[PDB]
Design an enzyme around this catalytic site. Structure first.
Site, PDB file in Angstrom:
ATOM      1  N   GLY A  16      -3.780  -2.326  -0.222  1.00 67.32           N
ATOM      2  CA  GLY A  16      -4.357  -1.503  -1.270  1.00 67.32           C
ATOM      3  C   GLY A  16      -4.723  -2.295  -2.508  1.00 67.32           C
ATOM      4  N   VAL A  17      -4.655  -1.627  -3.653  1.00 73.05           N
ATOM      5  CA  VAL A  17      -4.761  -2.286  -4.947  1.00 73.05           C
ATOM      6  C   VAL A  17      -3.447  -2.066  -5.710  1.00 73.05           C
ATOM      7  CG1 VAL A  17      -5.860  -0.293  -5.985  1.00 73.05           C
ATOM      8  CG2 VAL A  17      -6.151  -2.532  -7.033  1.00 73.05           C
ATOM      9  N   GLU A  75       9.693  -2.359  -8.736  1.00 67.42           N
ATOM     10  CA  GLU A  75      10.078  -3.066  -9.960  1.00 67.42           C
ATOM     11  C   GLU A  75       8.978  -4.093 -10.249  1.00 67.42           C
ATOM     12  OE1 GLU A  75      13.158  -6.186 -10.037  1.00 67.42           O
ATOM     13  OE2 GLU A  75      13.257  -6.124  -7.883  1.00 67.42           O
ATOM     14  N   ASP A 121       3.967 -11.983   6.532  1.00 65.27           N
ATOM     15  CA  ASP A 121       2.865 -12.519   5.742  1.00 65.27           C
ATOM     16  C   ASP A 121       3.286 -13.228   4.459  1.00 65.27           C
ATOM     17  OD1 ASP A 121       0.234 -13.201   5.364  1.00 65.27           O
ATOM     18  OD2 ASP A 121      -0.274 -11.429   4.208  1.00 65.27           O
ATOM     19  N   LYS A 123       3.533 -15.851   1.625  1.00 66.84           N
ATOM     20  CA  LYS A 123       2.608 -16.747   0.955  1.00 66.84           C
ATOM     21  C   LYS A 123       2.959 -16.796  -0.536  1.00 66.84           C
ATOM     22  CE  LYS A 123      -0.831 -13.111   1.258  1.00 66.84           C
ATOM     23  NZ  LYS A 123      -2.198 -12.755   1.616  1.00 66.84           N
ATOM     24  N   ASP A 139       5.567  -7.341  -0.874  1.00 62.17           N
ATOM     25  CA  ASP A 139       4.415  -6.977  -0.038  1.00 62.17           C
ATOM     26  C   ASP A 139       4.732  -7.215   1.408  1.00 62.17           C
ATOM     27  OD1 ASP A 139       1.823  -5.916   0.383  1.00 62.17           O
ATOM     28  OD2 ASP A 139       0.887  -7.840   0.483  1.00 62.17           O
TER      29      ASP A 139
END
Ligand SMILES: Cc1ncc(-c2ccnc(Nc3ccc(N4CCN(C(=O)CO)CC4)cc3)n2)n1C(C)C
EC number: 2.7.11.22
Length: 279
Positions: A16-17, A75, A121, A123, A139
């Site tokens: 998403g954003v 948070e 994922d 990174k 994320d």
């Protein structure tokens, strides 16, 4: 969502954003993720993450599900590891801080992996830092896309990959902190694989039993000889190079676990420095 006031945009993916936001209610400053246009399954898995609380995992405060659209309230942390690496590029992140960050992220993973949860994922962009010297996983990939930290088993088409994929990713990140350069910066799936092969050797049945029957394995892959790690992450000391090489073992079964990595001699003198952060 009437309860939140957007402050600024801090991320975009095809999840998403993400916005920095303020609870209109009562000013918690938070990170607000507006998710991808929601099936029953997604709700339950995400509700499982709300219970996955650890000091090195960005706390999921709330899941707001009204009207088909999905929001995740986290948070807020002030900086990601990528920006800190870029800011620290002339001098390099000091080794004691690299080591502390690595130890903390291995603690996070150990916890997640003990609960059968994979990140998938990892990174620099989803590792977040604060002024106290903490680093946190964010994320959770709860399944242009960056391929640089992808484990070779994923690239070779393994459907049912393991917690070892996160160890691989974290190893690439470790290397990058040390050298101030991405270890394997591929810009396609085969480029990513061939960059791995050029550095670690083309994998074969000797170092990776079953590699040759993986879905996207091809006999026609070029056969590169392995390079030594002294070339790959100078001037990292022997303990660090030992640990890194075990984090980048081709065979996911031989790859070091998060828990075993925490016992590695590299962490004998581990401390928790404070980064100097400019916010
Ligand atoms: C995805 C995702 N879901 C939740 C978060 C999250 C959780 C808690 N805190 C944050 N804080 C952040 C994240 C990113 C940034 N910077 C990203 C890079 N940047 C840029 O301007 C890039 O053009 C400055 C802000 C600052 C705070 N995120 N995130 C982050 C990784 C974007």
């Amino acid at each position: 969502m009437e309860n939140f006031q957007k402050v600024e945009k801090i991320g975009e993916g095809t999840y998403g954003v993400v916005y920095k936001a303020r609870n209109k209610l009562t000013g918690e400053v938070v990170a607000l993720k507006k998710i991808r246009l929601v099936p029953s399954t997604a709700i339950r898995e995400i509700s499982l993450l709300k219970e996955l609380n650890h000091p090195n995992i960005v706390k999921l405060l709330d899941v707001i599900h009204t009207e088909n659209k999905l929001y995740l309230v986290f948070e807020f942390l002030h900086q990601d590891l990528k920006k800190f690496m870029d800011a620290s590029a002339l001098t390099g992140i000091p080794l004691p801080l690299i080591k502390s960050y690595l130890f903390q992220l291995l603690q996070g993973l150990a916890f997640c992996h003990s609960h059968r949860v994979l990140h998938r994922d990892l990174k620099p962009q989803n590792l977040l830092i604060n002024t106290e010297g903490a680093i946190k996983l964010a994320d959770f990939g709860l399944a242009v896309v960056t391929l640089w930290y992808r484990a070779p088993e994923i690239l070779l088409g393994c459907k049912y990959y393991s917690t070892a994929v996160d160890i691989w990713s974290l190893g690439c990140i470790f290397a990058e902190m040390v050298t101030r350069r991405a270890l394997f910066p591929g810009d396609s799936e085969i480029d990513q694989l061939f960059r791995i092969f050029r550095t670690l050797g083309t994998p074969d049945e000797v170092v990776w039993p079953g590699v040759t029957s993986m879905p996207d394995y091809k006999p026609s892959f070029p056969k590169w000889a392995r390079q030594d790690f002294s070339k790959v992450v100078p001037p990292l000391d022997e303990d660090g190079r030992s640990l890194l090489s075990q984090m980048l073992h081709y065979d996911p079964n031989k790859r070091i676990s998060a828990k075993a990595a925490l016992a590695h001699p590299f962490f004998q003198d581990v401390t928790k420095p404070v980064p100097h952060l400019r916010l």
